[PDB]
Amino acid sequence: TIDLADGNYVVSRGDGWILSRQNQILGGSVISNGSTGIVGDLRVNDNAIPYYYPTPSFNEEYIKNNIQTVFANFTEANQIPIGFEFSKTAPSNKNLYMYLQYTYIRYEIIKVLQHEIIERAVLYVPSLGYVKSIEFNPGEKINKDFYFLTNDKCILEQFLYKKILRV
Amino acid sequence: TIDLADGNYVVSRGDGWILSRQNQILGGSVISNGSTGIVGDLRVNDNAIPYYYPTPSFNEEYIKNNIQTVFANFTEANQIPIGFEFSKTAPSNKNLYMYLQYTYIRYEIIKVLQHEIIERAVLYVPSLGYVKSIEFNPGEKINKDFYFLTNDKCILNEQFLYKKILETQRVLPYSNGLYVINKGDGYIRTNDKDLIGTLLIEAGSSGSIIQPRLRNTTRPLFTTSNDAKFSQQYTEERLKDAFNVQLFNTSTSLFKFVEEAPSNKNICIKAYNTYEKYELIDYQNGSIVNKAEYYLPSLGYCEVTNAPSPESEVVKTQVAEDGFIQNGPEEEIVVGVIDPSENIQEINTAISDNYTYNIPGIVNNNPFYILFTVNTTGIYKINAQNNLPSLKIYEAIGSGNRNFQSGNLCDDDIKAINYITGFDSNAKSYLVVLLNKDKNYYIRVPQTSSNIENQIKFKREEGDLRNLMNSSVNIIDNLNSTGAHYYTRQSPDVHDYISYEFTIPGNFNNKDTSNIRLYTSYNQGIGTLFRVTETIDGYNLINIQQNLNLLNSTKSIRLLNGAIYILKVEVTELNNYNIKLHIDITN
DSSP, rough: OOOOOOOEEEEEEEEEEEEESSSSSOEEEETTTTTEEEEEEESSSTTOEEEEEOBBTTTTTHHHHHHHHHHHHHHHHTTEEEEEEEEEOTTTTTTEEEEEEEEEEEEEEEETTTTEEEEEEEEEEEOOOEEEEEETTTTTTTTTHHHHHOOEEOOOOOOOOEEOOOO | OOOOEEEEEEEEEOOEEGGGGGSOOOOOOOOEEEEEEEEEEEEEESSOOOOEOOOOOOHHHHHHHHHHHHHHOOOHTTTTTTTEEEEOOOOTSSSHHHEEEEEEEEEEEEEEEEEEEEEEEEEEEEEEEEEEEEEOOOOOOGGGGGGGSSSSSSSOOOOOEEEOOOOOOOOOOOOSSEEEEEEEEEEEESSTTTTEEEEETTTEEEEEEEEOOOOOOOOOEEESTTTSSHHHHHHHHHHHHOOOOOSSSSSOOOEEEEEEEOOOOOOEEEEEEEEEEEEEEEEETTTHHHHHHEEOOSSEEEEEEEOOOOOOOOEOOOOOSSSSESSSBOOOEEEEEEOTEEEEEEEBBBOOOOOEEEGGGGOOOOEEEEEEEBBSSSEEEEGGGGGGGGEEEEEEETSSSSSTTTBBOOOOOOOOOEEEEEEOOOOOEEEEEEEEEEEEEEEEEEOOOOOOOOEEEEOOSSGGGGGGTTEEEEEOOOOSSSSSEEEEEOOOOOOOOEEEEEOSSSSOOSSSSEEEEEEEOOEEEEEEEEEEOOOOOSSSEEEOOEEEBBBTTTEEEEEEESSSEEEEEEEEEOOOOOOEEEEEEEE
């Protein structure tokens, strides 16, 4: 129930979106006592493929053009490789497991009739990534919510919108 | 002198061997006045290159094959560059000379006659390096043993792993289907078959083992029980369905390990390559009828060790059996997947308060799914004609978060599903479930052996039936005589419901009240009880005896005959895969 006038809106929900079920598909580092683990990635070619979820009247070309008109030109940026890395040190006598995810920028194209969203198309642009770590003991029960994500969510949370037309 | 029976033995003497006369001098750096010197290499193409020292009995191919059968495959492991680095900071007002060598893995193959070694062949497999440094002053004599090594020697760990050359339970309440189980990360193989390598760091220095991904190739492992069905391609497709795994034998993800030794003693770090273990199981009628295991390459494992006491003899230990060791945290994530051999029909219109679905002829009486979405969050009763067959309701994981249009179905093509309710059986039940506004659900219809068409009704229930949320109301029809009736169904998980609707035998006159005994045989469950009055718009439920304890309960409740009663059981302890309810009638 958005508080917006009728029409189509291009919306940015900000960087920091981690996708569901896609948590440990890149693996994780296990660090023993004292050691330091540095896990990184470097977005070039296949790590930089946007994911479109289109709806009728909002096709892929529509989403791409309207997103890039008012927000970052992800097609141009994704050509330039960009690296990132996370460093973490294990305690004096403990084991530390830390796994890596990809973060995405969530873009939307929404249709507002009256004051209700009646149509939404989504686009995910891979931004950087995110390392999640825990300390564990041999034979310790770890909460399932640490490993598995059921719904997409933002780890960082905004709603930017634009209506689509001296001497 | 050895204490092994006569024959041939493949022997690993550990990692961290320094060659004589410092084979392939490389030089060192002179640092001064608190500056830090960092020296490293990258084992890729010539820095690799195993050194063979054959014997007439053991030729080069003999050594290569026999070593690689038991221990790590160096031929396919030296094709992936691996980096190492050593960092040392000079004191405030002195000069420090660093000095780099390569360490190797010694791989003797020995022929034993009597209790003696008569033939030995040595294979030096290249490994990470070793930096030695000294603090020096101008015009100061330095010992030659710091500079020149006369004989081969090991610096890391005394080790002798030999093998003989041969002249050749738990009750799972899962519904029937295919599941993918993430069973944790950090799996390594036995006998150091995944060992990237070991660094020895002197006191007050830093050492690092790096995977720079100069080659993207990896090597997943796979073990199937029925290659006809669960082939490697099939398992990869099911992994893609479950956890959306895209890259299997390719990875672009750096990982490196750094360790600074304390200023008083030395340290060692072992780096291993690890695997994430996935089990693809076909689970039918309470037993795992098929299973495959996929080990996806992961981001390594670091182990920090200290050198043992200097006065310690070696022990000739035998190699361990082939297998996996989990160095990571305990994990078990079970995700059901849509069977790709079963058709999926769709309902493109969001379901309003009523809807009926006609079974198409293209199905041809086969198990299949119906994808559908619900217009407004609420409790729905889903059934077939005369409640035959019994359906199973699933739920797409992560559906509804992404794009959507109001009033229609946005097929997200998500094939990871959560079982909600349903019986896998001729059992006359109907589902009462709670469905949301944007999530996609699958109604699974089993194999029907009748040529007559079937209709599936999706009635939204705004009434007293909401008490039976997320429950498959089973219909008890063969209740017409006194006795000890028993019904066996698939037992729901803990804190999950299963309902039983029955009409007491005998005519109804608000009299002739009989005694009814309720109890389960194996699984303890809290029971409710409702009476049903037949209205024109739905079912009106009035509460009767609440909060029963049903595990072999000894109680009789006075129920007048000819009326309809619903018993709702919530399982609190799962002892059997099948729940087993008893309806006993006494006059």
